Amino acid sequence: IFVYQNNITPSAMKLVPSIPPATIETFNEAALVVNITHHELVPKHIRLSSDEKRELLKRYRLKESQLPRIQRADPVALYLGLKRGEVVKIIRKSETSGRYASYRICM
Amino acid sequence: MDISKPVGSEITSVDFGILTAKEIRNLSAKQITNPTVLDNLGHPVSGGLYDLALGAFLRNLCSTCGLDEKFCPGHQGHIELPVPCYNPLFFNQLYIYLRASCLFCHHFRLKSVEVHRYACKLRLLQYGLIDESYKLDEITLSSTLLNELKSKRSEYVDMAIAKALSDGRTTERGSFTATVNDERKKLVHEFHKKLLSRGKCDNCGMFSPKFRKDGFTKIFETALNEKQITNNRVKGSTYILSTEVKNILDTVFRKEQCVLQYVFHSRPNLSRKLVKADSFFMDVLVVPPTRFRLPSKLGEEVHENSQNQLLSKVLTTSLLIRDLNDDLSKLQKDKVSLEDRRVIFSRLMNAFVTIQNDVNAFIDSTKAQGRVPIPGVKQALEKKEGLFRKHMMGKRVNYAARSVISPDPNIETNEIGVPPVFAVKLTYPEPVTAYNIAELRQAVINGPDKWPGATQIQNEDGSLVSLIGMSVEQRKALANQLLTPSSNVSTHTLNKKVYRHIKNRDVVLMNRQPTLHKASMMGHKVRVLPNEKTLRLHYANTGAYNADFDGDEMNMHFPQNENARAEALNLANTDSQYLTPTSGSPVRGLIQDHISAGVWLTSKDSFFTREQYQQYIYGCIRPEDGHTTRSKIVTLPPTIFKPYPLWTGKQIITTVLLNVTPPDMPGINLISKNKIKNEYWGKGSLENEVLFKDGALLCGILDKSQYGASKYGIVHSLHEVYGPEVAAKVLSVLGRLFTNYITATAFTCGMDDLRLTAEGNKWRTDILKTSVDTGREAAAEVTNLDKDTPADDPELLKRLQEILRDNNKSGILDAVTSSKVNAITSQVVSKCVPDGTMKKFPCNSMQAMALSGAKGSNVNVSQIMCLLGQQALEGRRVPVMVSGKTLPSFKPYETDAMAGGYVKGRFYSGIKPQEYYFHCMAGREGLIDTAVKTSRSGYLQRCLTKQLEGVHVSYDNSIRDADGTLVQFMYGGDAIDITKESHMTQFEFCLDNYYALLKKYNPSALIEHLDVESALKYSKKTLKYRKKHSKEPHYKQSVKYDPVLAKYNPAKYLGSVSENFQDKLESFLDKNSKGVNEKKFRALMQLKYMRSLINPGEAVGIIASQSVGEPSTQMNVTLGIPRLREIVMTASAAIKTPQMTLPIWNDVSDEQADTFCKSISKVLLSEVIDKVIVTETTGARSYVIHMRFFDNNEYSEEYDVSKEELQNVISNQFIHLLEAAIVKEIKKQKRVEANNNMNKVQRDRQSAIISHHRFITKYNFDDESGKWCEFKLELAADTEKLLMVNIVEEICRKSIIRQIPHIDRCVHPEPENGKRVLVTEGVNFQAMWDQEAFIDVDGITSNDVAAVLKTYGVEAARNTIVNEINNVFSRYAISVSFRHLDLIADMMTRQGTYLAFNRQGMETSTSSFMKMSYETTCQFLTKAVLDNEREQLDSPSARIVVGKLNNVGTGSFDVLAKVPNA
RNA sequence: AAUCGAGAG
DNA sequence: CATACGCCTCTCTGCTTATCGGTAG
DNA sequence: CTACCGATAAGCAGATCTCTCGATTGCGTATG
Ligand SMILES: [Mg+2]
Ligand SMILES: [Zn+2]
Ligand SMILES: [Zn+2]
DSSP states (O other), rough: OOOEEEEEOOOGGGGGSSSSSOOOOEEEGTTSOOOOOTTTTOOOOOOOOOOHHHHHHHHHHHOOSSSSEEOOOOOOHHHHHHTTEEEEEEEEETTTTTTEEEEEEEO | OOOOOOOOOOOOOOOOOOOOHHHHHOOOSOBBBOSSOOOOOOOBBSSSSGGGGGGGSOOOTTTOOOOOOTTTTOOOOEEEEEEEEEEEGGHHHHHHHHHEEEETTTTEEEEEEEHHHHHHHHHHHHHTTTHHHHHHGGOOOOHHHHHHHHHHHHHHHHHHHHHHHHHHHHTSSSSHHHHHHHHHHHHHHHHHHHHHSSSSSSSOOOOOOOOOESSSOOOEOOOOOHHHHHHOOOOOOOOOOOHHHHHHHHHHHHSSHHHHHHOOOOSSOOOOOOOGGGEEEEEEEEEEETTOOOOEEEETEOOOOOHHHHHHHHHHHHHHHHHHHHHHHHHHEEEEOOOHHHHHHHHHHHHHHHHHHHHHHHHTTTTSSSOOOOEEETGGGSSSSHHIIIIISSSOSSSEEEEEEEEEETOOOEEEEEOOOTTOOOEEEEEOOOTTTTHHHHHHHHHTTTSEEEEEEEOTTTTTETTTTTTHHHHHHHTEEEEEEOOOTTSSSSSOOEEEEEOOOSSEEEEEEEEGGGGEEEEEEEEEEESSSSSSEEETHHHHHOOOOOOOOOEEEEOOHHHHHHHHHHHHBBGGGGGGGTTTTOOSOOOSHHHHHHHHHHTOOOOOHHHHHHHHHHHOOOGGGTTOOOSSOOOOSBBBBBBEEEEEEHHHHHHHHHHSOOOSSOOOOOOEEOOOOOOOOTTTOOEEEEEETTTEOOOOOOOOGGGSSSOOHHHHHHHHHHHHHHHHHHHHHHHHHHHHHHHHSSSOOOOGOOOHHHHHHHHHHHHTHHHHHHHHHHHHHHTTOTOOOOTTOOOOOHHHHHHHHHHHHHHHHHHHHHHHHHHHHHHHHHHHHHOOOOTTTTTOOOHHHHHHHSSHHHHHHHHHHOOEEOOTTTTTTOOOOOTTSSSSOOOOTTOOOTTTTTTOOOOBEEEEEEHHHHHHHHHHHHHHHHHHHHHHHHHHHHHHHHHSSSSSTTTTOOOTTTTTTTTESSSSTTOOOOOOTTTSOHHHHHHHHHHHHHTTTTTTTTTTTSSSHHHHHHHHHHHHHHHHSOOOOOTTTTTSOHHHHHHHHHTTBBBBHHHHHHHHHHHHHOOOOOOHHHHHHHHHHHHHHHHBBOOTOHHHHHHHHHHHHHGGGGOOOOOOOHHHIIIIOOOOOOOOOOOOEEOOOOSSSHHHHHHHHHHOOEEEGGEEEEEEEEEEEOOEEEEEEEEOOOOOHHHHHHHOOOOHHHHHHHIIHHHHHHHHHHHHHHHHOOOOOOOSOOHHHHHHHHHHHHHHHHHHHHOOOOOTTTEEEEEOOOOSSOOOOOOOOOOHHOOOHOOOOEEEEEEEOEOOOSSSSSOOOOEEESSOHHHHHHHSSBBBBGGOOESSSSSHHHHHHHHHHHHHHHHHHHHHTTTTOOOOTTHHHHHHHTTTTTTOOOOOSGGGGGTSSOOOOHHHHSSSSHHHHHHHHHHHHHEESHHHHHHHHHHOOOOTTTTSSOOOOOOOOO
């Protein structure tokens, strides 16, 4: 993680993907002032592991991409460090059914 | 269709493609030679447009097929045009590919490394690999380096595809979804943009000339540059022929075949066919058969087909250019008349232009040039009256009738009155069998006139015989030989079909346009009546169809196959739709006169003797017609025994229930109320509540609330306890009961019901005559002048005139005066009705039907008998003429309620002409508003339903569109059916009826084929887990335990239920008040939940679209359909009215809250300037700009702005904006006292100002009072006159003093339902995130959706969407289910972005037919043919296009047949 | 067959 | 004077496109 | 220095239920 204020150097932004599988994330202070996951409007997002993700896929007889998608630029993916292909798990406080658990893949 | 000629084969998909130029030549049965369509003698001409080779034509045997006009299907031919013509469909793609191409090296003017990168990415996306296509960009790290990059990237992509195919993430055909389609289109779009941006070709270094276009069929290029030629020379508006562009494109496409195969194939190309660039050019046209180009005789006039016209025009130009080529060879040998040779060569060029434009006209009418224009092929299938919508989505149909509807309360509520004329015309082919010959022989004997009868008899060989012109003995022979063995071997499994008339056995489809929701098209068992020629309909269905009898008519479709009969009889029949899935509220029930008769028969004052009681019961029931259950009518004990046996009306209702309700089943122990307050019946009355018990009525009265458009009634509970069938029979039986009753004791209304008493009139008159002072005081208060001032006051008149001129002031005045006169009206109504009427309820029949809900309302009664009241034009009183008069009679600027549209009259004693005029204005406005609102919701509903029309619950309880993509895992999170959730939370009723509910929720009959342990065990486990974790913020709570339905099948595992349901069930089981025990009650509630689940394949998307569109017919933040379409139809980030809700800390004061609001709210420079004075002096052209400021003590404490801050603003923003404005205007033009020296520091500031700015010469801002600020200004002498007022004003308005960005005010609204809130006129979350001392930043919820999406996440965006969509429905209290709205939100956030419901929001869908039928059929057709998309035939629209059984509902499964023998 | 006009719910 | 053959101006969304400069080769 | 590009207000393409009646259909000029 590299927290950057004001503006980062545009010449310096072309090196983050080039790195080997070891990633390098940057986060601005602008969204760092308030933890958005504490805001009760935003549901609590949680990661998923390979085994349970494969279990979900076998339960629903689906493809990777047929699931709903969450975008790589989503502010909560910036919080949770989601890679491309990590099925986030969201908890839906649905008024109709109290606690409900849904998903959105990150691709 | 016929049911005895099945079709072995069936279409399974369809893939678009380009018709190759040589296959048509191989295909074509004849070329098209000469334009002349027909010669004389009425004969076709060989080589014309009506050749016999193109199909049969008017008893001319087809020279290709040899059949006649009834059997020749047509045969395509081709016209060979010499010069290849641009295909107008793909002109933009042709331009894109021709441009950004280097004819020098025959490659794209782009680096081969980047081109190969894009090609590899696309070949990866073809198999659905989305992450691989992004990690491909990790290899970047000169010929050797570039070739190494190519080799490694291609090896990596091949390995990635091999891994995907081995694992199973793809097949040989490829993995294509909505997300993959989005990624592929995004990548292709960026690739085209990157390609059409470069300068000189980067693969060789050579420049290439540019191209241009004047539209379509208009191609041109350009010349090089003076420096470019030098670059080219050291490296080493001309017209372009169509064949030249083709020759350019052929080479480059042969070179880039790899990238072009990965662009022009969204699926992996199995056929490995090439991508030939001649596809963009139509070398040869196709002529549709004479069958599709026939003419018609409109009497004696015969019209030549427009397709023939355009094709003959194209062929005329073809013959022109061909015969012009004959004489171009004449000058070939004589190469000395080259000038005239160049003349005819320009003629040949213009003929090329003409033929290309002729083909452009033949395809797209608008792509022609010249200013009745003939429709083209694109125009023939483009729009609403095109082909897809007018002939594939909806078609005229056979065996369907139509007539005016009329009422008939003597048919069962699941029936319809079929006139005899239809019953002898509509038919149904009944294949004769040994169980039908008794009635089918009779139908054949009776023939086509005597119902029941038959019209045709279809023979075993499929041949037809007509009974229309036969004799009785002939038809007798036919009927006696009807069923007989067939000696023909081929048709040894077929039998005769008799086209019998429609009996009462069958079922029919009824539909009253417009079909706002699905309930407006149900099924009715037919009953044939020998009355007039009109359809007769029961009264309960008027609510479902929204139908009246004022001249209404509705289509009556007759299903012609057992599949459709069983469909309409079980899924769509009118009884199976008691409630609507909009909100789960009832939609059926008796309407007006049955209700008003119920208020009388169930009145406590009504008794009926033995004879009258028994007559009523028998007439209502008629056991011979099946209304009973005990094979003999049963009775009741009379209420009274001495002197003589009397009964009661409530006993009549009780025995009616007892006779319809099935025996050995407890009666409905119901507790509810109705629309009639206790004080109406007198002191000590308890009639407000009804107390049903054991199938007996014991208190209160029946009403609209217990049958009709009201919930929790007796018929609703009969529904909830015995299904919808018994409720339907109760509706029918009460319809026949209150009808025969109302004949004996009729119901009427008259002038006596509309009167008052002397005291009532006195009260009315006095409280009305207060209105003079009422209106004057409203005006005086609004104008802020002193109260109790005479109306003729000049200041009052002036203020009223200013208010009239200003729209907002007029609105404020109207609102205040309207509130006052509404207060006066309410006082009058309360004091008079019901305490003043000379005739009182229940005698006062008008008031009775207003109270009872049969018709009208308390408002209607009040304005008939007491006061018509203030008239509302839009949200105002009445438009006022510019002279200030509201009418000719009323004096200008009159302070008077009667002038301001407040009518004091009543319809009983008439209205004065001025009030008549105002009331006419208001009524006309209402009519216009209704006329607009009828059509406003049509586009909204159609747009929603075109996209949601496929989504349907999978057999895994998850809802997912027909392409497979998943929108939600549970419907609303609970899988609870909207219709079936009627009484899930009505535990008191459930307990009261447990013993009756058991007979349907039989455990011993529904326990074995289920698991009853695991779900309940895990449920208790998770329940205890959640209880133990107690209360903690949702981001802290663990997720070790999930909802039970997520892991356990809600339909296979008992006890797997929602979480709200469990909490409320335990809370109401905490009563501990009574056989029935908690275990049996719990088990029965859980079986109820198990049977209350949406069945798989339910058309949930259609249902939600209807539930969100149909209520929209009855429609400061935007409200109504505008808000709804803004949320869903457009998804506009430029939302008209954005706001954010800011909770404030409980430990703050109100005054501090206002201080913080004014600290945040935006202030502009113009807010604090009384007047700015400009002194244009030319003797160089000086401009003293002296600005007057408001009182410092006032504006400092109104805006929280200080002298120092204003000084900074003027010194930095305002002067510079003004200077830029002055200099820009000149650039475009060519085409109080003071002291001479404030102090030395002031003079240094002045010098700094002069140095900093360009043509300023003075400056000084009062720092001790903040009352003025001047700055002298000059320009040169060449400039003209300048306004120096409008520019100053606009710059002043733009320039800001203290603004939080994206916020333009912060008001303090009065708290509602607690939870104090500060709401602004903008959205900027970053701004208040810094301020936590006041705002509870953790709970800011804003009006916008894009803002919250990009600053908080997709799920916060979906929350905001549901909240906003419910909010607009919540101003009118049209409560729609929280499941439809969430389904809409998650369908419009299914790609991680805020998507709308329009053509832009459906681009990334696999079904091209859906988009083409929706709109812009051409553009979606190009996007499907060019990528060679294989339409998979799974969206409902595609099925309708091709003719395949829809998969939603009864098409979500298949049907087998267990044979008995090997 | 289109265009224009009258209307129905 | 019949008969026959062609030339001609009072909405809103969402994607065509901006002029210019920031800034590393 | 300048090309690569990243972003700045304007031109155009395409949107905005079912039904039953009736009336009428652009002209100019050339040969016999
Ligand atoms: Mg009607
Ligand atoms: Zn033929
Ligand atoms: Zn080149």
